[PDB]
Amino acid sequence: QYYLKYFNPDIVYPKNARIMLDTGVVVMSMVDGNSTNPNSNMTGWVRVNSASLIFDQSGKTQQEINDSQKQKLPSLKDYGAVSGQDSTAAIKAAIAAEDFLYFGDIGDNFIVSEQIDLRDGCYYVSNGAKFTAALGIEGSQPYTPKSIINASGKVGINISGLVRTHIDHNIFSALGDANSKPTISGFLADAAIDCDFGKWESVGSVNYYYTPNFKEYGIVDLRNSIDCYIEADVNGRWTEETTASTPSTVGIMGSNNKGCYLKGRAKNCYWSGILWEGEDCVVDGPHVRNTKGSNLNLAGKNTAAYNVDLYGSEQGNISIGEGATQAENCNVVGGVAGNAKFANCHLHSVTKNCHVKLFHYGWGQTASAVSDATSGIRCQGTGNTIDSEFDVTYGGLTVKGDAVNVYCSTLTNPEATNIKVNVVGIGARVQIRAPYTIVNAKITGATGDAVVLGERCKGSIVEEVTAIKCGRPLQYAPKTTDANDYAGVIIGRINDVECTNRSVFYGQKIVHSQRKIERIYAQETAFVLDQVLEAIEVYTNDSGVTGANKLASAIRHISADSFGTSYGLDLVASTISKNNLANSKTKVRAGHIEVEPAVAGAASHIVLYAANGTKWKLEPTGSASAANWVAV
Amino acid sequence: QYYLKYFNPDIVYPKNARIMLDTGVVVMSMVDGNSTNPNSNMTGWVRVNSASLIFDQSGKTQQEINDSQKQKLPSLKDYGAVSGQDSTAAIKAAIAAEDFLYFGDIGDNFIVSEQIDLRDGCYYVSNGAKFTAALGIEGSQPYTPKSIINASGKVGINISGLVRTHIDHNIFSALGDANSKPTISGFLADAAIDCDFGKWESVGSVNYYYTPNFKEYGIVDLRNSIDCYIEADVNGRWTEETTASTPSTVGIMGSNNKGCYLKGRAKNCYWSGILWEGEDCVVDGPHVRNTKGSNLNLAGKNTAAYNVDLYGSEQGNISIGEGATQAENCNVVGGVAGNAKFANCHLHSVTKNCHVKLFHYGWGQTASAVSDATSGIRCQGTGNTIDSEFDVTYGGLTVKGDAVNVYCSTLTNPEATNIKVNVVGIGARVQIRAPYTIVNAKITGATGDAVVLGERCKGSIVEEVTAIKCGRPLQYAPKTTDANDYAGVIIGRINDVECTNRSVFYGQKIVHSQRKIERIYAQETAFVLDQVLEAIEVYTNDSGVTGANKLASAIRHISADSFGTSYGLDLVASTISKNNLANSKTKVRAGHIEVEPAVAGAASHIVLYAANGTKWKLEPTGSASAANWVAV
Amino acid sequence: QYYLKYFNPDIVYPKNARIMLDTGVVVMSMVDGNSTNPNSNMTGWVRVNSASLIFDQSGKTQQEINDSQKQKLPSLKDYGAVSGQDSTAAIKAAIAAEDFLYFGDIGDNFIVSEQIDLRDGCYYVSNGAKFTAALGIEGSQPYTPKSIINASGKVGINISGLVRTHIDHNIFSALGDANSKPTISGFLADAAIDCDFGKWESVGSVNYYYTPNFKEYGIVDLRNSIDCYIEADVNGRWTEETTASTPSTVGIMGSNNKGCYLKGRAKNCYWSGILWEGEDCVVDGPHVRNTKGSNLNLAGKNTAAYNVDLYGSEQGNISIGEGATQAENCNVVGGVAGNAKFANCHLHSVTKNCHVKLFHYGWGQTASAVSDATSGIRCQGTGNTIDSEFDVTYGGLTVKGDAVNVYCSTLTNPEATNIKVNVVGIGARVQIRAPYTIVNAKITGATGDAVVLGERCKGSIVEEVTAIKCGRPLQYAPKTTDANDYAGVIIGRINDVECTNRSVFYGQKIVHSQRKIERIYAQETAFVLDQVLEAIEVYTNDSGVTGANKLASAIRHISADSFGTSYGLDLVASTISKNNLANSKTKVRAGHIEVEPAVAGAASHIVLYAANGTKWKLEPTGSASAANWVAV
């Protein structure tokens, strides 16, 4: 008929005997004296439907095959995580169990009710696996900061690939009060050591304002960590939503780190796009768009942002040392910063030896009237170096305020001192109001002064200013009434090309030079009478002389002749006459000197001394007569 | 005997009853009243050889295990793609079905008959999987551009790993005509948004010349895309084959992109190695070898190539704005460019505010005679900055033409204006023929002039030129006949070390300086009679004076004494005598002046004025006699 | 009863007949005339427990499923490698068999007895798989260098992910003798071509000192290779152990390479952290800590280290060309170097055209007295460019020796020539003792001289030195006795701000300038009698004059008047009187000159010539009397 036998209570089964369970599944006896009921007791029985009873061609059991094949890539889904379900339990189970672990892929979205703690020395792979926050993640009251994925106090994690985080702030907005609120990061690692945190793409955080001891957290946050690496791509939803209160703060946030590397992209942040604070940290090509805070904040010590790509702030592109204890050798190493309401780069008073190199434009985008805040580079601090490249027309934005603005308020404990300035660009001013400032500039097309040095520039060296088709190359405008204000200020080489107004100086420099023979060759071919080959001209602004002629004194290398077949010197002097400075010359000539009269109708003379130290003039009579010594 | 039962037409099968199919496979009844013929009708039957009827140790079915294990890594080969077969159908099936997808490995080579379209938001992994083009890929007539893998109009692709492409142009060379041809890219993405395209290694393309509206495509091509990233390593087979016609064009081609990043390696390209055009695009360390076109072409706006590694072109290393509408702030940010037939870097007339920093050598490798094309840096455009580092001996190549060549043809709407030049190196010239040029140079070992400023240099500032063991530091050689030509040209500090010939100037600069006390200390220890401590010397090139002495006038700080126990001034004058300029001195001395005669046998004198403005000389008689006023 | 039938010797089995083996496993006949004993002979029998006799829902066999699922990710463990066992055989088996191959994960540690040779064109993936050396790896006598993983003479490897290596030197320390020892690298590739070697984390090597022809190997070593890429993170255990002899040498070692890229991290190395030698090689952000050798050694040709991060050496941060044939255009492209016993950067005599740009501090940390070795930058070679940024206070370390020290020992075949120096920083000296040196400096807070130029500076141009609150801006201190020593040395613009002592010069420069009108405008408002508007002052150091007044000669632009309502010139002369230089003036004035007496009680005069060339003085009598010509 058919094959069917149940267990018989009275029978002894030999080895290899097959029967059925009440379920229908077939059992074989492994023993010769089998009396055991396989429905109750599998002692000396095997189920023939077992994986361990299927054989591959190789000689491996199917069991052996499933075991080795699984152990290659242990997944969250192996632990019964479900995409579009709460997977919390399953996730934590997976982590606790598996040193190497696969999250899943781009089609996976695991819902998480509790903070996911990574484990020490583990390796995690991820193909685009998303994690989504749900209620309860904020954890226990007195609320302390949490994340979806956490590596707080973890050592030697590796993450290979892409992890995605989703926080909807609208779920959490009703929780806490005035004093205490949830803080929910995408990723947090506080006190992590030597971790590669792979790649993140994260939307949203939860960081509503609470009144005492408010702590901002990033979407992606690494705090108090050592030798950690992450890549992160965050969206803060600023300008993509309307919200009652400020939901989220900083995009990507690094704070009190040592030796930590970011590859960083931030948008739509209600505070700072990227903040990176600490010691020997690196921001590698940060890319920031449309942030309510500053695009990029650096502090700490020897923290460098390389090849920046910043656009669109309610504040500035770059703060150095904003709200910070320390900003020592915090550097920006090339890039582009555009469309800031205030400054491209604000180097705060805290800054020590910060180096900024930047292409920058469309600062001072504020509706608000011009201030120190509306600068390209706004510089305070101690011995900062600016390498400015700028253009005012760039990206069809209209600037407000100086290209560079370096300034103290007082010479007594100055807020800005020892700054080095290197500035090239088109169509705004460099303003300096700070001691010991070293200035190099190339400026094209400024309406006004290329460069001004105002008050409080004591001991500034202006090495070189080249100005093409400006209002004025340089003006020095010190505090006249105070010797201290302009003491030791050196204006070096000023280069004027088709500037409207001459440069304006103050003070007299002391210069020490090597002995020279200076040789001026004139190629020209032809020289008319009293033609200047080479001159130095000294002009006065004396009270006593009001009226257009102000030549005080001059030395002129002259063509003496209507042929240029003789040459001399013009030793120029001056005296007040008819409310003007009248000029006259001692003429140094081949075989003669000639002293010219002070004015028409005055005689000229030679003053000599007797041995008794009385003084005598030889002065012509208007006749061909004996010369006599006339007392003077 | 044995176990064998077929279906019986007359029998009712109880639950758990096992029989055989005619095939021999065993069936169990799931029902108590089974009358159904399992050969025809599996209603209430199960095949006992099913995966769903094998149980792992865990409690999972084998079916459940195969389902979860597959869904980890869905592959092309799961969809019945075969390596070394046409896999087109299978591929497209795989893509349509699977959000996450594995290509395969280095031993996989899938043959593709039709363009492979990726899908939006998908994640693709690849371990070296190769795709090979076959006939039909060119698609339908009127031929439009195709690729092996395509992401035209795709959003949010991720590619993890390495994809390899093979196009043999020899399959496609007979297709189209004069007017219409196939275009076959390795990879194309036209109008892609926010895609990471991982890593490519691609050989060959199909892009034969057709007569109207010819469109070049890359081996690897990203057109009209936003926020896309690729790495690509291409071979164009130029110099590895002989071909009737030009088969392929550009290696890696980026055109009208916004915010797109390349890591790029190109060789053996019949056009450009790498071209990258657009807005805010980045070329990160492009590595180009042996290209018939230019090694690297930049255009658009704020497109930067970082840390270039270019060698071996029939054209140049770098074109900026070749055949382009726009080349505004298109920058090269360090690297090395060598072995160009023409220029290392050609900044075309289109260029606005382009910055080039480069080590460069072995330009002008052409057999053809020296031209503007045979330059290190060939610069036209508006306000480009050159940072040149060069060496003519470098890599044992022999250069032709100037190190830097900045030039307009006319001052009226000049093709080059406002260029900034910073040049250091060994053993070639800097030539400037352009207005408003700012020059800084350090040149060693040039045969001729370190620097020349030719015609059309109006309003150029030459800040500093240091020349070691050149022919000449600087020559200024303007259009003499035109005041406009040399108007406002400033030659600053020229530094001559063991140059053969003195520097040659033209024009006279107007300089405004801060008031100085200048203090020249001479350490020497010993000074002979008429020894010059410090001098200024003015020389003439007057027509009227032909014959070697051309000192017009001088001021000399002099040791007056054969002991150096007295010091004075020499006020030097000159007059034509015996077809030479004869020199004579007013001697300013402690307690005297001394006017020397113009020539031997002439008397000296003092000219003074009477109050009636007649002039009188005191002139010695050759006796110890009364001095009289003598009319003059 | 039950289901059980053995093979019967007398029976013919029809097709589909099932019996048992003596083992109990069920067999079905595939043939109608089966007479074959399945216990001895499986001809026309199948085992029903076969994978090929289980069917997935899809229609695939379980066999077909195991085959395709395995071939996705072939592993070492598939080949029966065991973690914490000797896996050598299994590994080599895996490699020989599989073009694509998975090592395993972070929980895998395979013990290796013999060098593992990779294969040409293969692709390897690794999730943190560790390999550990055991005895026998050193291989056969005469000992030749070995590694755990080897790619010597391999082409076109790819490695994706992270491989980890462990060498315990304590296993191998008893082997060889005086002449011959094991050399055991983590990874070695000698003569590899176009390989991506992914990522390494490696501890330890074996490289004990043997007396003739000692060859240092890296922990991670690439020798004589072309177009190879690696990332490597090594620990040499220096300072983590005590050892009898030097066990290991170089961390990461690149030697005679062409076009090879490193991402490099080294610590605790008994020699060099990272060495990279060859042609067109790149060290991308090398990160070195706590090394007994130099942190970083470059040689060869066009080898560049970018954005260095070096701290803590018994030697220096950077050697260029240490123990090398060639060091031509070997560059350091930004970064930070700190805490070297000797120099931050030593550019050896071999160096040609090396460019160094660096922030540097805490050099000369040695207990040993100041030498040339205790410099920030120690520079020898031919035409090296230094861009120095320095700070002596930085990181609370106390420096010893010059910031920069550029030096030859002789002008005859000089060890240092043609060096370019650009130096900014705080609180140490720049020393130059080398010909043709170009100097630019900005120095703050040096105790002594900002800059000194010593002996052997022939044909040096010091373009600009800015000194703020130094001891002295510049001193030039040549070999006085030798004209050659200071020939052609140009000291340009020296800027002194509140320096203690004036700059000290030697020699007189020849300067060629463009013709100028120089216009000095004085803004001041008020001028007293004999007030200097602008002056040049020439001072002597003559033997003959000992005693404080050393003004030799001067030209002074003067306010002539107690109102500043007249202006002139002061032409200053001097003569020895009462063991001082006494000053006197020719006064150039509006309508007069005035010659002042040499000293009180001397008369002044005018010297003129007769036509017979005899000389005559007009000199006052002390009366209102006839002027006579007095012979002189």
Author numbering:
A (entry chain A), B (entry chain A), C (entry chain A): 154 to 785
Task: Quote the study that presented this structure, word for word.
In the case of APK16_gp47, the protein includes a part of N-terminal particle-binding domain (residues 154–213), which has three antiparallel β-strands, the following N-terminal helix-turn-helix domain (214–252), a large central right-handed β-helix domain (253–661) having 15 rungs, as well as a C-terminal seven-stranded β-sandwich domain (662–785). Rungs 7–9 (numbering starts from N-terminus) of the β-helix domain are complete rungs and are formed by three β-strands B1, B2, and B3, separated by turns T1, T2, and T3, where B1, B3, and T3 are solvent-exposed, and T2 faces the three-fold symmetry axis of the trimer. Besides β-sheet hydrogen bonding, the β-helix domain is additionally fastened by 18 salt bridges and hydrophobic interactions between inward-facing stacks of side chains of valine, leucine, isoleucine, and phenylalanine. Noteworthy, none of the pairs of stacked cysteines C348, C381, C413, and C434 form disulfide bonds, in spite of their location proximity. APK16_gp47 crystallographic trimer has a diameter of 75Å and a length of about 150Å (without N-terminal particle-binding domain). Each subunit of the trimer has an interface area of about 4928Å2 (16% of the total subunit area). The trimer is stabilized by a total of 201 hydrogen bonds, 27 salt bridges and hydrophobic interactions, mainly between the β-helix domains of three subunits (formed by the side chains of L226, F253, I259, V279, I591, I614, I621, I643, and V650) and between the β-sandwich domain of three subunits (formed by the side chains of I689, I708, L722, L724, I728, V741, I746, and V748). The trimer has two cavities—a small one in the N-terminal domain and a large protruding cavity in the central β-helix domains, which, however, lack solvent molecules. CPS-recognizing/degrading part of APK16_gp47 has no homologs among phage proteins deposited in GenBank but shares amino acid similarity with hypothetical protein (WP_228157370) encoded in A. baumannii genome. Treatment of the CPS with depolymerase APK16_gp47 resulted only in monomer of the K unit.
